[PDB]
Amino acid sequence: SDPSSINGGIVVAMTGKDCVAIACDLRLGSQSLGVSNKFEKIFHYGHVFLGITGLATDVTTLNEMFRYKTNLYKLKEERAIEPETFTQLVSSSLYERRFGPYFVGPVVAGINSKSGKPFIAGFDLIGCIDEAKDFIVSGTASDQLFGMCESLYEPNLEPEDLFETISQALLNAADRDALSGWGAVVYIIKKDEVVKRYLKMRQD
Amino acid sequence: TGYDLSNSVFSPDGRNFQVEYAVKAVENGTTSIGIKCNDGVVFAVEKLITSKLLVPQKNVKIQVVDRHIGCVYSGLIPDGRHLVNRGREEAASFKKLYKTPIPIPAFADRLGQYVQAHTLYNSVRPFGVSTIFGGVDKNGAHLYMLEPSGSYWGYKGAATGKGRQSAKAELEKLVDHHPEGLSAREAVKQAAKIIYLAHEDNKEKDFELEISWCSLSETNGLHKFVKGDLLQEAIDFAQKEIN
Amino acid sequence: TTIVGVKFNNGVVIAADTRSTQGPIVADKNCAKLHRISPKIWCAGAGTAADTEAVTQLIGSNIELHSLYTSREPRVVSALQMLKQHLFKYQGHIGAYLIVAGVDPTGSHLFSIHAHGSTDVGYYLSLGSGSLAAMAVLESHWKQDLTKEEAIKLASDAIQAGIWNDLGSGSNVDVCVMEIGKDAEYLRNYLTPNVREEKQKSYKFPRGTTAVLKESIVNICD
Amino acid sequence: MDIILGIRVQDSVILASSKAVTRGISVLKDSDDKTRQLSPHTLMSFAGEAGDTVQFAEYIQANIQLYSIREDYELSPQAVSSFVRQELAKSIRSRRPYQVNVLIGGYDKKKNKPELYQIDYLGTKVELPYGAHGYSGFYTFSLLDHHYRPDMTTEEGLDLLKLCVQELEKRMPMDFKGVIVKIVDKDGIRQVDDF
Amino acid sequence: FLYX
Amino acid sequence: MTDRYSFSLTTFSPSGKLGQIDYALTAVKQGVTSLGIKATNGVVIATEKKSSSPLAMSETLSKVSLLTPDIGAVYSGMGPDYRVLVDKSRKVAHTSYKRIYGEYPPTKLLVSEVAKIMQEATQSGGVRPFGVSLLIAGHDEFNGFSLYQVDPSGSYFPWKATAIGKGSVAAKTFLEKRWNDELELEDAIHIALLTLKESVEGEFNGDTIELAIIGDENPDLLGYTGIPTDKGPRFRKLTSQEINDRLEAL
Amino acid sequence: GSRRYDSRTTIFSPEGRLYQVEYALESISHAGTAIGIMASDGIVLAAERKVTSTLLEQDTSTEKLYKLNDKIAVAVAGLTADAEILINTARIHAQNYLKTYNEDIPVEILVRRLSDIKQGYTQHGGLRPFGVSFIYAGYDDRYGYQLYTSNPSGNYTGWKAISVGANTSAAQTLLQMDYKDDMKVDDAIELALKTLSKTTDSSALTYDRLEFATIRKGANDGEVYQKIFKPQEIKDILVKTGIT
Amino acid sequence: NNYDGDTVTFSPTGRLFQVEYALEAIKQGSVTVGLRSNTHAVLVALKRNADELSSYQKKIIKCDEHMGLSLAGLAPDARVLSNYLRQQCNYSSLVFNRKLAVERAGHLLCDKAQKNTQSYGGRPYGVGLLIIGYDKSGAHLLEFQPSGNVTELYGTAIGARSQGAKTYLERTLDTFIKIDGNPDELIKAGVEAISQSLRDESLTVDNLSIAIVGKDTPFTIYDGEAVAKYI
Amino acid sequence: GYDRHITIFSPEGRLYQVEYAFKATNQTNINSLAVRGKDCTVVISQKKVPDKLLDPTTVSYIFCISRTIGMVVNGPIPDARNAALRAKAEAAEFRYKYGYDMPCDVLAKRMANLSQIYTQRAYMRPLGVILTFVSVDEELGPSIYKTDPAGYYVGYKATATGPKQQEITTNLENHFKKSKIDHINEESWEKVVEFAITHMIDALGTEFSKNDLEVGVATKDKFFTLSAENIEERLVAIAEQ
Amino acid sequence: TSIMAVTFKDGVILGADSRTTTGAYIANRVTDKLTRVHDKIWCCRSGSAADTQAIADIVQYHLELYTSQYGTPSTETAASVFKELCYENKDNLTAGIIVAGYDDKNKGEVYTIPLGGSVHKLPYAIAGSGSTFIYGYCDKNFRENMSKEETVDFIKHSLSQAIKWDGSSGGVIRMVVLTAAGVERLIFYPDEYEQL
Numbered sequence A: 001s002d003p004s005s006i007n008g009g010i011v012v013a014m015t016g017k018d019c020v021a022i023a024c025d026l027r028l029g030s031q032s033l034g035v036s037n038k039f040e041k042i043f044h045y046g047h048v049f050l051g052i053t054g055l056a057t058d059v060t061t062l063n064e065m066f067r068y069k070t071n072l073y074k075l076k077e078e079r080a081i082e083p084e085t086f087t088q089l090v091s092s093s094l095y096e097r098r099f100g101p102y103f104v105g106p107v108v109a110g111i112n113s114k115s116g117k118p119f120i121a122g123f124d125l126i127g128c129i130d131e132a133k134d135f136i137v138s139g140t141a142s143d144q145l146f147g148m149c150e151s152l153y154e155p156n157l158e159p160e161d162l163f164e165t166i167s168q169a170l171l172n173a174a175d176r177d178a179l180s181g182w183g184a185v186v187y188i189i190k191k192d193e194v195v196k197r198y199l200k201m202r203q204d
Numbered sequence B: 001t002g003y004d005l006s007n008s009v010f011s012p013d014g015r016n017f018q019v020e021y022a023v024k025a026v027e028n029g030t031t032s033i034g035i036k037c038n039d040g041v042v043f044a045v046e047k048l049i050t051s052k053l054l055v056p057q058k059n060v061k062i063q064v065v066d067r068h069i070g071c072v073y074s075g076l077i078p079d080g081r082h083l084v085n086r087g088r089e090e091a092a093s094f095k096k097l098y099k100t101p102i103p104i105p106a107f108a109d110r111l112g113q114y115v116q117a118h119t120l121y122n123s124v125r126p127f128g129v130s131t132i133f134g135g136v137d138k139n140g141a142h143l144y145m146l147e148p149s150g151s152y153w154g155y156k157g158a159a160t161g162k163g164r165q166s167a168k169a170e171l172e173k174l175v176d177h178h179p180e181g182l183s184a185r186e187a188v189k190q191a192a193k194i195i196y197l198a199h200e201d202n203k204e205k206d207f208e209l210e211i212s213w214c215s216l217s218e219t220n221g222l223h224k225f226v227k228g229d230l231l232q233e234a235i236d237f238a239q240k241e242i243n
Numbered sequence C: 001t002t003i004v005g006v007k008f009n010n011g012v013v014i015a016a017d018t019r020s021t022q023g024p025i026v027a028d029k030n031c032a033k034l035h036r037i038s039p040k041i042w043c044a045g046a047g048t049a050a051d052t053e054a055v056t057q058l059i060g061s062n063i064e065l066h067s068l069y070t071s072r073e074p075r076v077v078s079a080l081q082m083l084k085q086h087l088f089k090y091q092g093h094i095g096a097y098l099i100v101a102g103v104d105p106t107g108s109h110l111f112s113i114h115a116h117g118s119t120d121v122g123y124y125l126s127l128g129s130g131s132l133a134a135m136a137v138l139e140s141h142w143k144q145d146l147t148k149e150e151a152i153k154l155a156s157d158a159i160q161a162g163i164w165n166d167l168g169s170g171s172n173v174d175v176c177v178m179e180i181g182k183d184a185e186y187l188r189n190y191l192t193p194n195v196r197e198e199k200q201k202s203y204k205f206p207r208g209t210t211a212v213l214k215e216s217i218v219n220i221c222d
Numbered sequence D: 001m002d003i004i005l006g007i008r009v010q011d012s013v014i015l016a017s018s019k020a021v022t023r024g025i026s027v028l029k030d031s032d033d034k035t036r037q038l039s040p041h042t043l044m045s046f047a048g049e050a051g052d053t054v055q056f057a058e059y060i061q062a063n064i065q066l067y068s069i070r071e072d073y074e075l076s077p078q079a080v081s082s083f084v085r086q087e088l089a090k091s092i093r094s095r096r097p098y099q100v101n102v103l104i105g106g107y108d109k110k111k112n113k114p115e116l117y118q119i120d121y122l123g124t125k126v127e128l129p130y131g132a133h134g135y136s137g138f139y140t141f142s143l144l145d146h147h148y149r150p151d152m153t154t155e156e157g158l159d160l161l162k163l164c165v166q167e168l169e170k171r172m173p174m175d176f177k178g179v180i181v182k183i184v185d186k187d188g189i190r191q192v193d194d195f
Numbered sequence E: 001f002l003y004x
Numbered sequence F: 001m002t003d004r005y006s007f008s009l010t011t012f013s014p015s016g017k018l019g020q021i022d023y024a025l026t027a028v029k030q031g032v033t034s035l036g037i038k039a040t041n042g043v044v045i046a047t048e049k050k051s052s053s054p055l056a057m058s059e060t061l062s063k064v065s066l067l068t069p070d071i072g073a074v075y076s077g078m079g080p081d082y083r084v085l086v087d088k089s090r091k092v093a094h095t096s097y098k099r100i101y102g103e104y105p106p107t108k109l110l111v112s113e114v115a116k117i118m119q120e121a122t123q124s125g126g127v128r129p130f131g132v133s134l135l136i137a138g139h140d141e142f143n144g145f146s147l148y149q150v151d152p153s154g155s156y157f158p159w160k161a162t163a164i165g166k167g168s169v170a171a172k173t174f175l176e177k178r179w180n181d182e183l184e185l186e187d188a189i190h191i192a193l194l195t196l197k198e199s200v201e202g203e204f205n206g207d208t209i210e211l212a213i214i215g216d217e218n219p220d221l222l223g224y225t226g227i228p229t230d231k232g233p234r235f236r237k238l239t240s241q242e243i244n245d246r247l248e249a250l
Numbered sequence G: 001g002s003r004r005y006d007s008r009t010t011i012f013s014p015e016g017r018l019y020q021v022e023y024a025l026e027s028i029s030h031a032g033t034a035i036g037i038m039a040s041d042g043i044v045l046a047a048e049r050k051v052t053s054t055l056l057e058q059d060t061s062t063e064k065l066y067k068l069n070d071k072i073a074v075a076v077a078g079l080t081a082d083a084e085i086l087i088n089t090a091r092i093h094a095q096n097y098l099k100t101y102n103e104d105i106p107v108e109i110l111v112r113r114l115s116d117i118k119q120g121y122t123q124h125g126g127l128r129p130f131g132v133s134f135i136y137a138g139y140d141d142r143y144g145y146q147l148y149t150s151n152p153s154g155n156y157t158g159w160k161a162i163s164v165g166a167n168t169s170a171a172q173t174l175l176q177m178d179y180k181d182d183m184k185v186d187d188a189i190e191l192a193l194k195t196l197s198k199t200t201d202s203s204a205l206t207y208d209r210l211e212f213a214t215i216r217k218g219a220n221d222g223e224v225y226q227k228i229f230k231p232q233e234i235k236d237i238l239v240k241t242g243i244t
Numbered sequence H: 001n002n003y004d005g006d007t008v009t010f011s012p013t014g015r016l017f018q019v020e021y022a023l024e025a026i027k028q029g030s031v032t033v034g035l036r037s038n039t040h041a042v043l044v045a046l047k048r049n050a051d052e053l054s055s056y057q058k059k060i061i062k063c064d065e066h067m068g069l070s071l072a073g074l075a076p077d078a079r080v081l082s083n084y085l086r087q088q089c090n091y092s093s094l095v096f097n098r099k100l101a102v103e104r105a106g107h108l109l110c111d112k113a114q115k116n117t118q119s120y121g122g123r124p125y126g127v128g129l130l131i132i133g134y135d136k137s138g139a140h141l142l143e144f145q146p147s148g149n150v151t152e153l154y155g156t157a158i159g160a161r162s163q164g165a166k167t168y169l170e171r172t173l174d175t176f177i178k179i180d181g182n183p184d185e186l187i188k189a190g191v192e193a194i195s196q197s198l199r200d201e202s203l204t205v206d207n208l209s210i211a212i213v214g215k216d217t218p219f220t221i222y223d224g225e226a227v228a229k230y231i
Numbered sequence I: 001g002y003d004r005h006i007t008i009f010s011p012e013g014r015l016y017q018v019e020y021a022f023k024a025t026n027q028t029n030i031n032s033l034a035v036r037g038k039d040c041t042v043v044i045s046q047k048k049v050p051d052k053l054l055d056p057t058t059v060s061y062i063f064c065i066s067r068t069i070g071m072v073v074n075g076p077i078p079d080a081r082n083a084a085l086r087a088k089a090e091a092a093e094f095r096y097k098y099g100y101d102m103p104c105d106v107l108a109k110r111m112a113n114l115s116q117i118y119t120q121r122a123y124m125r126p127l128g129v130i131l132t133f134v135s136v137d138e139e140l141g142p143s144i145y146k147t148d149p150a151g152y153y154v155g156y157k158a159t160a161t162g163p164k165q166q167e168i169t170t171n172l173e174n175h176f177k178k179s180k181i182d183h184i185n186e187e188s189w190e191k192v193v194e195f196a197i198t199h200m201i202d203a204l205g206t207e208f209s210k211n212d213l214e215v216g217v218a219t220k221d222k223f224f225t226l227s228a229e230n231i232e233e234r235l236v237a238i239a240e241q
Numbered sequence J: 001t002s003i004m005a006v007t008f009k010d011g012v013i014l015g016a017d018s019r020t021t022t023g024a025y026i027a028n029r030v031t032d033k034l035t036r037v038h039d040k041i042w043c044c045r046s047g048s049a050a051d052t053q054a055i056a057d058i059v060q061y062h063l064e065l066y067t068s069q070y071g072t073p074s075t076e077t078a079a080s081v082f083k084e085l086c087y088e089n090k091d092n093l094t095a096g097i098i099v100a101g102y103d104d105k106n107k108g109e110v111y112t113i114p115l116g117g118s119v120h121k122l123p124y125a126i127a128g129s130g131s132t133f134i135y136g137y138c139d140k141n142f143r144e145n146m147s148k149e150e151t152v153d154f155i156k157h158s159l160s161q162a163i164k165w166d167g168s169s170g171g172v173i174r175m176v177v178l179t180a181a182g183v184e185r186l187i188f189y190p191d192e193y194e195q196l
């Protein structure tokens, strides 16, 4: 009965040269029992990408909540929300439920359309912002991901190289965690094109 | 026009006609007076004996607040009772928090702010009473008179009701003739006389005299009613002066 | 965490470490724990990271509105009073331990706020897990009538004591100097004595190393 | 309550639901239908806490029936599942949450596709080819992983379901008194009377 | 959550 | 007791007029002339400081108010109504935007929030409309410089340049002749002072004229250094001295 | 008490009319004309700006045409401020529906709820009604392209082509004359402008006094695109039809 | 005229017309007489019927074992005020194990009636009450008017032609006050008093309503054949 | 014409209830005057006690709001005391919340904002009072800030209020034309009080005894009113010059 | 914590240590546990620092607002306000406060308010953890109508012992003198009081 480790799952985001990458596993389980191998944890609102680990009912609820909020934002602002602004909206929204929180580990990723700067950010469950140049990690294999990212990562990787680094970081971390894996998805995000790749990984 | 139909409405003069109309209800009422003395205050009131069927001494109009304040009023008697009920709540909450019994100036503003509040809205009627009240606190004796508008001042002597001009004229003479001060026992006898003299403006029905007093020496700073020998002594003094 | 405040003759200086941790793991290697309440009122936070940011942001907002309403530059005692009344209301459930410092028309000020709503006054203060390491240095070296350059040295030395000796503290030293009659200067990453040594090897993978099942273009446009 | 299974095949969704209602050391009933029809082409099976199960099922049924009258239109299985999930998502942070786990088997008339949704009492929704709730999954999922094919007919789906019920009757500790089976397709909802 |  | 006025004091007349809005606009007409001119690289908002008494210190009374670091407001009509609107406008910029997005609202959205407050006084129970028209000048990263008028009704229009109050008819005709789409901020300030002289009768100097700009970022006015992204407020109130300098080359 | 000053906004005339609804409609009849024309392959929204000034910023302006979601837009006639209150409510109602059902709100449901809000102000609360008429132009996968109008009464009806605001009598006669069912969007665009051009109280119809929008399936394959026309785009479409 | 729209408005001469109109409702009401000695207090009420087929409107209500009133005017308002008195009498018993003083009863009615004369929306009570009771200070009779004015009397009468009974009691004052330890003789004096307020009609068996409270007598009402003794 | 009964606009865009509240200001027939020294702010008001039965010590239109702030009222005493109590409550709360003494100008704005609400909200009438706030602010120095029923407020070099306000105003105007400064160039508050009384005597054209005047004085860290003997001492000084 | 109030001939004297401890660590070694609620009404704070600070702030506001309306409050009035807060919120407060003030009529007065929220008017009071060790000493040594210098010595010697034995008490001895003359702050350093 630890909400953050019932369903299991991982998200990792990395920055490259004029690009960002966000990746997640596909497992949704009920403790030992694997239930779904299609449960994607990465969403997007325009060009801003959000990955959410933790309790799956809250992952779904927050996605629906941020879609709701980014839609009203766009109608009133007459423009798509930027990653830096969305990061603040996520933080505000999570801390609004400070004494009854969503059991989640969200990760914002995207490129500012005006400045062209790669941006990634992670949050705790109460909504504290963790901004990083290099990488953000989240989920049941966060320890493993921290170990993989910290050793594998190097700055200013090209989109095609960054893909290999983030993919090997997720895969090898997921294989040392019981509640993570069962398939993976990697988003490679450039200024005005986004490639989405499904990885082949061991299914145990 | 139509400026007088609603409370809290300014006329082009800058007047609240509904408050001035409430004053007419006070002017219509029986005579009530207050006399500030050396170490306390004395209250007296005219009680019109409408019928022989009225039980003497058993329709008390003067009211006590806390244990040290006396209140008397002319006009709509129920409105007066409502104001005293409020005064008792204000005095209780003051004692509860600050331990000390409420000072008279403090108490005066508690009524003043409340009566003034009934001139701020068209959903309430102004008070149909001028209230003469006071007592003894740590700073000595205080007499006050409060009007429908929420206007109140400290007084040496106060009078309101149908015989106010008669009573005021008689009060002004006491202030002039006793600059050093009037004693508590003297003020009780003068209070009786002034009610009897002010009864000339209400002389169709004969009346019943009622006197109370707070005095640091005589009543030990507490509010008490003047009854028995002291009351009959004051009545006899007043009866002698009219003749 | 290691946050300290030091008072000098013409101002106050606050410094903090740059390490944020979840359990024994380091979440943020270089996180700024110095917050702007107002242009000349700055605050260093320890305890629940989310709580310190949120409470600082909320009061920072209410101080700006108060400044506009009164047509006056905000005072440190206003920020302190608003903070400690808010923290007290929540009976310590908001885990914000702050060192509040700034300059205002009244002069230079240095306070500390605890989650339960208690406040301290001092010429030198230290909060967080590394406070005992920092306070040891402050107690050893602090004196009356410090200069600006001495106060910065003492403050950064007290943070360093935390960085080395406390496991909770590490990485870099952030400093903010609030001097009277001058703009406050925020010295982010004033000291970076924990630079990562060159790795023995590049782990840049040969392209195609990762096995891929599917590719697709994602539509971000309307 | 205990055993509720669901198998989406080519042209239909099949919901199996145990008939036993046990309280203490007494099987009170052996013919209980743990399902409500939400709309002509949408069926919901439910299992969990006593009282909560039926109270929740009927509440959802009423809301979907109200929508159907108001708009003179049947809500898609996707739309109904999303509505049900949100109700459970609200419920879990209530004073007393609904401890009800559901399978929603529906036929989308606009897409001409069967759809099976597995939603737990937390409000965790997933679209699956086959689903189960409680201990049933620990046996049936591995069995279906092996024997299930996506292009199976309704008759093949029922044989695959019989294989699940047989395995559960062999290895499950408790006597769940067999299952009521129902098929959701383009022609609506009908019950298999002999299983 | 995180601490400092 | 209690607010028994839970019904509208603004209703439609048979003709279709909303009396209390029309009468609020009449109150704005009586109000002192204020104007706004939009340049390529900034905005200027100006108004006469009608002194109630020569003993009164007209510096204490601010007709031109900062709402955000990058937004300013001026009015014509009833000053008290304006003052409470500025208080509400400043707070709503925080509560409904900055406390959510961690940045100040763009001009059009803050204007929209002010308009909403003034619209509610037009329909809510037991209240009269606000007796003011606002001119709100502001800058934001994605819209650039903008100027908006807000009427008692809650209606707002964007302007290149306009005037409101006493001599608005004559002031608008004057601005039409002088305004072009290539005006630099200094040229717009020059025209603002020319236009305002026509409506002003008595003294015309930096002490009787209140003028503010939305221009370049002012790092000197920020109050701190160290954060490169924070470059200071674009709103700046011209000093009594700065106005008098430009009145010599008039 | 306060009874003396109560207009009684929600009562019947002896004839059985709602005074405040009738007077709100009289208010809207003086507002700039707004036209909606529904074609087989899209909807046109045209609206005449109220007597424009030469110094009004035209490009960064929104008076008449507002976006409710990606599939629905409205043309406004009446008090702009009143309209914006109802638009923000409509925008939220659309997102509430999406959050609940994971499907974009059907047009009629959004229109009914907004109309039901207006109805409330005529029956209870003792407040003045919203001095606003809407033309709802939207698309859903049930009914396809739909035009609606709502008015202060809270009554709504569906249309093929409709006008609200000023000179609706003259505008509706001209639409009823030249409209037909097999009409294309580009034809509807021309009709909309020709109607405004004749019914306008102005000397000549120009780009700076017009707001224009189309809801086509003119995007790439089975998806709807909203186009709120830019000043230069209105200038081009006005020359293309030969009005200027 | 222009100043009788509601109770919150004073007239130019300082009158409350809504309170005066409420007072008028009492004058229209059927006569009821109150009188007491030192040992007993008596209510005598002339009950009124709609017609010969109708019952006679019950005028007398019991508040406690030692207190009760008679009414003249709006009977529903009398029910509200009597119910309030029952609660205040009952509160005194449960909390303080103390019978409520008849004087306090009057003060509580006065303050309840007053609040209705100073607030918008409300209306004055449209009924007069004669409260009798026996407490720790002997027998009592009160006259309540909906203006808020409560008066302690030896005897009185309210309703239509009440002036007849009130004049009689004013003459008889010295006689009936000293009817001590004799219930039947005090009632006779009350029945003779109400007879002075009769025109064309006389006191019958289902017409007359008598109540009594005293030293060793709980508040008890007499109707029907029980009052035949006194005709 | 019910647009004259409550605070809603007349056809010509006026609030008649605000205008009539202004006329209520002069109902007391009392003239007040405020001037600033270097170190102090002095406020003086006429004291008329017509009734001989009145206790003259209790007759006051000057109030001690906080330790630092003083307030004089032109208008009826009930509304005056209403305004005084609120101002005291506001000044106390400000100190508790924000940890420093409420400035004179900030209290004036707060009371003016309250006054504004009564002109916009129907159920509340405006108070028939003009509030003149005086202090020695720790930032701005000697301060005079005045509030009216309209909800208007502004700072003053000096000010006058009452029936014969215009005569006092022009008298003060002519002095500041001559002196060429924003204040009374005087060291002691005693002489600033003497100036205030002297210029009121010249403007009104009446002589004052000790019981005809009421004086308030604001210095740094306290505001205080002068007793009859304090004023009498002051009147003697003027006479002997 | 070690605090005490002593009533002497010319008024009252408040005395306290300066040590605030979290567990066995000293958070502040220069705390000012003597706080002003009015010009000549002061209190001594023991228990939860957060709770005692919050209470003290509320009373100062109450007595400031009291002064605006009714002039200077009595020391009894101040103690009554303290009691009202402490008694009504006894479930959520850990605060032992000694209220000490100087009237001109009543002279020096000391009221002690323990955890319960009860009020006890005494010739002198002691409270806080350190007090336990000096009940014997203070009882044997206290006399009524002492001089200023005697009362300062009595407090200095008393708190000196309290500090010597109590781990939770230490630092400097602060004192505040309340007389008709005015308000005088005194401080005494370890190097003096330790070797008494």
Ligand SMILES: [Cl-]
Pocket (backbone or CB within 6 Å): I109, I110, I113, I114
């Ligand atoms: Cl305010």
Ligand SMILES: [Mg+2]
Pocket (backbone or CB within 6 Å): A034, A203, A204
């Ligand atoms: Mg496995």
Ligand SMILES: [Mg+2]
Pocket (backbone or CB within 6 Å): A035, D118, D119, D120, D124, D125, D126
């Ligand atoms: Mg599940």
